[PDB]
């Protein structure tokens, strides 16, 4: 970010390492809580565009998160386009161009052009504009939070099969990749995990059946 | 908080509702949790004394933590003290003062006083001062955590085995002791305070039985 | 209001009744479903904060999702305020006031005054400023929850017809299908998806008996 | 809410929490039920359009009852608009213009228009005569009525006649026809949409038994 | 009321007739809850102790509340004559004499004097500083309620006779009758608007019974 | 601070512990019952907001009283800013200023600016003020409490001796009495007002055995 010094002329530091530290841990445990979006927002203040892609390499290790986010900055950037068709030269001779959506995403532009904007008048407010394109981003990335196991599955002592049955959907439903062990536990482990009496169906039944064949002989 | 705006200009703000959201949520969820540290470390940017104790009353209802913080706090007021042994006269009239422990914690001082500090040249930062000793404070809230108790985890005559354990097992892990302990009290007295009817069915079954077996078993 | 053409020249034009009508039946169908969300867009270009609006009240009984929006927009009115805020006092009152939060969402401004921004020298969008949050908060009622499916209204053990027809005609409103493909739904499921104590009670009754005297039959 | 200060000033004045709590609390409890009217007016002392327009707005959650409202405030400005004189140069340049129906419901006027208005000498007093419009749109939505009706009510197997009885009770004076008819409806519906062994108990004891009887009875 | 202009025009107009309506109707419906504290401070704006005195008269049905308000308007008015004595005559020559705890209370005051005081300079605001007192008392009488009806009181088919018979007393203390009715009450429908099973042990114990028995019998 | 004897005269002086060591003992015994208001004000004349403050962090522990008193001190300060908020500019710095709500109840002041206020030119009472607020919240705080009697905690007919266990200790620390008191209840009332089918077990357990010995024998 820039700072203010006692002249008051503006002096660049790349971001904190500290800070850094701070943004790799609530990514760690909380890139999918929403709580990751005032944490990013706080530590993101007069920031550069340059400063938050040091930011989006930090994020980068929920492979789900640095591809959901990339292509909002995308969506964005090439709709910054279709409403901008910039002039060849600055609108402001001697100042720093109109920035298209690459400029923002702090990719196309250099550090001093994204200083420029940012201490310059006018509302350009790279990393402010930039920052709620990524806040964005997160708020898709948030949508996806992940449960894990589906082993934990369990039945209470005479209770039917229609409510295990919810309980082991919503334990698969969260999965994903590679299909075959899943399956593999799913032929076992519904039988397995079930009650006696409820065992005593779901092994009779057999591949024969569907689940919904079961849940009504099982009522 | 003190932010920026262009050419000398130090403007106190005021925090997000989503950082003080985020903050309340934070103590509420990980309040002797080691990660109310980085959460208040990443809430705190730009934070005046004045933001710190706002968040710290917002948030400090449980007198227990809120005085060892305090205390450390003291212990940290006491080393100032020993880094500000005696000095003669006025520092410079509308330039503000020294500022001890106090007036870092933001009791003695005003906002104005505490913008004063940190705004002057090269800055005394009496938030990022006060900041240091809160965040070895809430260290010590978590080092210094309050357990819970193995003994009392028993299964009751319409209570489940399975619910029962899940109740042992994250009691085991709340339980203060080493891991010699934890197996030994799992082995001993997760099957003696079970029903008798299920403690029943886990001797038949005996110590071999995998716990995954034990829950399924006594439903 | 102004709006800009393809080829860029300034028009002044109204807003239409066939956007309204596609904003209704989209909203009625999509209203936690993704493609709201382009459709909103294509639905918005050119729009000012009341016809913003207008578009919001003329779908202004899904209170839910203008509660979410609502809450996104105060959000990030607060968020202005602090790092926006006005100038103090009537500096010059009758000439480009500046506006808060609530006047980019239209609740404080008049039409008048949302195009005196707008139509002011210095690309002032207060119309894009307002979509650009309920795009935000349109991106979490998506990203909330979605999925309903009638063929799933299967019972409890002894489950009664009262109870199932209560979620059966719930889950059959709220399941996006046409009428026709309704009508085959309330004629294919209902005997069928019933708890068997009941399909019994109901294979006795017969067509001839009201979902009413089913709802009685089945206790 | 416009205020006082000494000497000539009038100050305008945030609206109070405690009003708008009361507000949602009254119309969450009494929307269609005549209370709503002395509450609204009583805590619409002082109000300005853009004041009563901020109490509609936090409790607009029915669209049709919105609407209705709407539409009386259109008469009832329809009617002003009747009223007033056909004025040609400036009757009161350099204080407030002219106020339309629009003016008083304070869609197109501003809050500074509003406080001028209803501040000096009394000339034309927005506030109130927009309170009057609102009061009579709150009357016609508590003289409207449709939601419920008696015949949905039947009883469940493992439902006490005590619990039928509440909701009977209550949707009863909710159904719509003369008492006399109501009673009647007591009489046939009550035992009529009963649980079977609870419809038995009922026949067994006749219509000459209390309805403290039929409580005790069915148990 | 003390009622003003922004032209410079300021004049007592008495408590309207329009206002006691309303607050009647509030305390009919709302005394014993909170709204009745926002609705007289909305309704008591620039209210001199004489308007609120005409104010105070109309909440007389209910009399032990009313009274313990006055009873507390005296306990602060002596101890506004302990706090603020007055001296012997005006306190500045030529001006107004100070006001005493009954001249607040409006008992010892004219219309005129507390005309005075609202219209002095510095802050001593008779009408806010009666408020007080009377908000004092107001919460006073919102910790009072109102229930239903005794004969009401009964237990389901097999409910506890422990909280019945704790239901049926309290209902039976609120209830408005003489003692030796509520006597006679408790003996006659304690036992008889019991559940059946309940009723008869309630008979086979006997009237010799204490509560303690009766919750032994049942249980 | 400063205070005024009985002669009339001005008098420094500074807090004692015995103040605050009867204010702790006085809410641990009496929270629940009236006489909490005229001890609390016997402890709180002289009083600055700062020693209000103290008083208050001495008797931190009971969260939820202290809570609802918090609420209603932000409340009322709210209330005070909407009717009084602070001049624009910066006036005369470190002579006087406008309080804010907070600044009353000390938690934005520092003691000189409350000593500032109460020693200015027409004593600004702002411990007075702000233990009003706190005598006010004081007041709906005993309003609120009912829980009594060990004796008193009996069970239903088919209801969990652990629960019991529960109700009935809970219960026995809230009751103040003596230990010889306690004891006696825990033998005499833990078996006598057992659930039948618990009870028959307790009787033949005996008071004797160990509540260990209960709980295995319970379920």
């Given at each position: 970010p820039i700072v203010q010094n006692l002249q008051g002329q503006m002096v660049h530091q790349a971001i904190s390492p500290r800070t850094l530290n701070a943004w790799v841990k609530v990514v760690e445990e909380k890139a999918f809580s929403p709580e990751v979006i005032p944490m990013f927002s706080a530590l993101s203040e007069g920031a550069t565009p340059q400063d938050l892609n040091t930011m989006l390499n930090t994020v980068g290790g929920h492979q789900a998160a640095m591809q959901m986010l990339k292509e909002t900055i995308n969506e964005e950037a090439a709709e910054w386009d279709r409403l901008h068709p910039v002039h060849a030269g600055p609108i402001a001779p001697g100042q720093m161009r109109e920035p298209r959506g690459s400029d923002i995403a702090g990719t196309t532009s250099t550090l001093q052009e994204q200083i420029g904007w940012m201490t310059h008048?006018?509302?350009?407010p790279v990393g402010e504009i930039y920052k709620r394109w990524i806040i964005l981003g997160l708020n898709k990335i948030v949508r996806m939070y992940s449960p894990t196991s589906i082993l934990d599955i369990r039945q209470g002592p005479?209770?039917?099969?229609r409510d295990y049955v919810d309980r082991f959907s919503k334990t698969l439903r969260a999965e994903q990749a590679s299909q075959e062990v899943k399956n593999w536990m799913t032929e076992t482990l519904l039988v397995q995990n079930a009650n006696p009496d409820c065992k005593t169906i779901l092994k009779a039944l057999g591949?024969?059946?569907t689940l919904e064949e079961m849940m009504t002989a099982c009522q």
């Open positions: 008048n006018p509302p350009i005479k209770e039917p099969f591949p024969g059946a």
